[PDB]
């Protein structure tokens, strides 16, 4: 359930789930899937910053 909701939230920012996880492991970030799915629903402005951090890792 958490994965399916990060997937929906990442594509609104222009990225798939699998490309997001690759970038997150690449930069350093190690937040859970449980907390990422919570930010996707509620703290959408915080989720956006994390997503564009993962894109900036060129992944």
């Amino acid at each position: 359930l958490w994965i399916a909701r990060i997937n929906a939230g990442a594509r609104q920012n222009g990225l798939s789930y699998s490309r997001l996880i690759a970038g997150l492991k690449k930069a350093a970030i190690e937040i859970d899937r449980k907390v990422l799915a919570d930010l996707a629903v509620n703290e959408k402005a915080a989720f956006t910053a994390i997503v564009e951090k993962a894109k900036a890792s060129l992944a």
Binding site: L1, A4, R5, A8, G9, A37, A40, V41, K44
Partner: peptide
């Protein structure tokens, strides 16, 4: 609703 972050099954 698979295009929204509020999706519940």
């Amino acid at each position: 609703g698979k295009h929204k972050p509020e999706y519940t099954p």
